[PDB]
Design a binder for this molecule. Structure first.
Ligand SMILES: CCOP(=O)(COc1ccc(C[C@H](NC(=O)O[C@H]2CO[C@H]3OCC[C@H]32)[C@H](O)CN(CC(CC)CC)S(=O)(=O)c2ccc(N)cc2)cc1)OCC
Lengths: 116, 116
C-alpha cells in the first residue's frame, strides 16, 4: 500500500517474523529507508541460539555489543504478501527490542520511496 | 521521483540547505523514513550561531549532548522542487556530520513510502 510520511506517526507495519529459532511471531516494525539491514528484537529468538558479533552504525556513533547478527536466515511475511522475505542475515536488538524493516527487506517487497 | 530501495545503495539526494546563518549549501542527504526529524551537519553553520540542547533516542542507548536543535527554521531545496522545504527546526549533528532527510521534510514533499 501507500504509506504516508508524517513526523508525528512512525511509518510502521505488522510483519510476521520467522527467526527459525521459535514459532513465527507477528510484530510491529518500523519501515526504515535509512536502514541498510533489518533489525529484529532478540525477544523473537530462543535464548539457546547462536548469534554473531559485529559493529553497527547507530544514532550514538558506534555501539559494540548492542547489536548482534543472526546465524540463520530470517523470513518475514507482510499482511499483503503471500511469499516470505528471506534475509540472508539481519541485525538482532539485544536490548531496546527494536523492530526495523530496512532496505534489505524493502528491496524484496519492490518497495520504493516516491517524492512528487 | 521514484527512489528504489536497495541495501547496497542508500537513498541519498543532493539538497540545498539554508541554515539562515550562512550561505546556502548543497549536501548529500540520506532519505530516512525512520527519522522523525531531519539531521544536518554542523559544518553548514557558523561557529558563532546559537543552538539548543536536546535528547534523541538512538542506537547504543542514550546520548545527551550529541545532537543539537536549530533556533531558526531551516530551508531545504531539492533538485525537483523549486519551492523550499521550511523546517520549523531540525537536528544538528555536532560530530558525525550526518545529513538525513526525515519525515518532517518528507511530509512537506508530500513524500510517501509505497510497497506494492
Ligand atoms: C550521511 C550518512 O551517514 P553515515 O556517515 C553513518 O551511517 C548511518 C546510516 C543511517 C542512519 C539513520 C539510522 N540508521 C540506523 O541506525 O540503522 C542501522 C541499522 O541497519 C544498519 O544499516 C545501516 C544503518 C544501520 C536510522 O535509519 C534512523 N534512526 C532511528 C531508528 C530508531 C528510532 C534506528 C536507529 S536515527 O538514530 O538516525 C533518528 C531517530 C529519531 C529522530 N527524530 C532523528 C534521527 C544514521 C547513520 O554513512 C556514510 C558511511
Amino acid at each position: 500500500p501507500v504509506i504516508p510520511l508524517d513526523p508525528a506517526r512512525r511509518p510502521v507495519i505488522k510483519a510476521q517474523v520467522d527467526t527459525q529459532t521459535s514459532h513465527p511471531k507477528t510484530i510491529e516494525a518500523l519501515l526504515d529507508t535509512g536502514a541498510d539491514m533489518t533489525v529484529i528484537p532478540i525477544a523473537l529468538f530462543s535464548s539457546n541460539t547462536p548469534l554473531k558479533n559485529t559493529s553497527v552504525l547507530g544514532a550514538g556513533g558506534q555501539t559494540q555489543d548492542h547489536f548482534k547478527l543472526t546465524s540463520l536466515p530470517v523470513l518475514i511475511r507482510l499482511p499483503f504478501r503471500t511469499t516470505p522475505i528471506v534475509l540472508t542475515s539481519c541485525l538482532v536488538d539485544t536490548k531496546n527490542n527494536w523492530a526495523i524493516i530496512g532496505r534489505d527487506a524493502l528491496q524484496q517487497c519492490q518497495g520504493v520511496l516516491y517524492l512528487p
